[PDB]
Design a binder for this molecule. Structure first.
Ligand SMILES: CC/C(=C(\c1ccccc1)c1ccc(/C=C/C(=O)O)cc1)c1ccccc1
Ligand SMILES: CC/C(=C(\c1ccccc1)c1ccc(/C=C/C(=O)O)cc1)c1ccccc1
Lengths: 235, 236
């Protein structure tokens, strides 16, 4: 299974799991903008499910746990992927090949400019660090597995083994990240520094997800179960 | 000067800067619980200010930048401390020597138990990894310098060499963390595996903080600017 994979074997697995890139429904008040984004998120979300299944180790976990991971990670994963796509588009966000939005077009939705700025800062940092695809894909898997691991129900011998498994795979991806960096020619010190630099960014992506989530939660009718909830429901 | 400190000099400066340990002012109910915690936290924030000035690097930043860092980090920093002190107290959170609360006492205030459970879990994880104080004091400093760095207003030339500076100091603290692990005799693999492990926990701490601010914001009427806000505005 996933624990005996080599670093090359893991990068491959991860690159192959990558889901196709989605298009938007076509390029401006609050409702029209939130509709595009909401539509794109939901389709990305449906793709995210079969991606997660292709991630080494994810499928060894019980369903309710798989679902908990996605519940906790889905907006982060959407965001890192956006930030990655927007890397070579300074001051802009590439939601889709046909939806490239301005810093300013965030102002279309009271609340969203704060969030656009954070995404722009994140992708700017990735550009400075010259983040690579092999690393991007690794980060994305770390988010999937780490964002929900501290919030299970650890009262049980089975939730212990679940946590233990996830942490073992997380170690394997760390091993993989270092492996990529050693191959790229960085020194030990540079390796350790880049590892840290990248994992600290994951803290900011968490922050952004929390904020996006809080904004989502305050915009919606409270009598409404949003589509992310339902999908994880029917799972 | 911070950029030329060695790993041993770094650990030292940090152990040296640790603020005293605070006692609860008093010794259930919903408002009585929040009273304890709020005062404890406010008193801890005050001590946090002088602590932060002693973190190598911090004082080289402009004032406005110092205040920003503290604004983004103060709840994470309290929380990691609580988690750290509660390590050898399973199922409990040691807010102070005279205030040891129980997982169950979290339901004393609505929504809190969610947060207590996350805290207990974090401290519980630290206990398996056997976190050391040298490590702790590094993580605490990483939260201070990192939590507000991706969220600086300006695009000026100075703003750039200001976060350049922060990232240099962060790199030095990564160096110190590893140095520590290597002295404890871990393998290279074990070393980088542990660094990742600790920094991934910092993601969870950020999350607990974000949750903490939401519960806070929702319990208090909007007519009120809270004491942490007042204090930071003034430090500026
Ligand atoms: C930052 C963009 C964004 C997303 C989004 C992120 C990446 C890719 C596409 C969209 C977003 C907005 C609404 C939703 C709604 C989901 C749902 O209603 O089920 C999901 C994500 C968002 C999230 C919250 C508030 C404003 C915008
Ligand atoms: C989890 C405990 C806690 C803190 C706290 C944490 C560790 C040590 C001391 C306090 C907390 C509670 C209230 C405040 C209030 C601050 C203020 O009013 O300015 C700050 C922190 C808290 C935070 C949010 C909601 C409920 C409790």
């Amino acid at each position: 299974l996933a624990l005996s994979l080599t670093a090359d074997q893991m990068v491959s697995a991860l690159l192959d799991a990558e889901p196709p890139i989605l298009y938007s429904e076509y390029d401006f008040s609050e409702a029209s903008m939130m509709g595009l984004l909401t539509n794109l998120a939901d389709r990305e979300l449906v793709h995210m499910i079969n991606w997660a299944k292709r991630v080494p180790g994810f499928v060894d976990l019980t369903l309710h746990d798989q679902v908990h991971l996605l519940e906790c990670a889905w907006l982060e994963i959407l965001m890192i992927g956006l930030v990655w796509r927007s890397m070579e588009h300074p001051g802009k966000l590439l939601f889709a090949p046909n939806l490239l939005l301005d810093r300013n077009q965030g102002k279309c939705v009271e609340g969203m400019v704060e969030i656009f700025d954070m995404l722009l800062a994140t992708s700017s940092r990735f550009r400075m660090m010259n983040l690579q695809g092999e690393e991007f894909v690794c980060l994305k898997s770390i988010i999937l597995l780490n964002s929900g691991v501290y919030t299970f129900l650890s009262s049980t011998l089975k939730s212990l083994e679940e946590k233990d498994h996830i942490h073992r795979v997380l170690d394997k991806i760390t091993d993989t990240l270092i492996h990529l960096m050693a191959k790229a020619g960085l020194t030990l010190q540079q390796q350790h520094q880049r590892l840290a630099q990248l994992l600290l960014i994951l803290s900011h992506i968490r922050h952004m997800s929390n904020k996006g989530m809080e904004h989502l939660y305050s915009m919606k009718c409270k009598n409404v179960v949003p589509l992310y909830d339902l999908l994880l429901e029917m799972l």
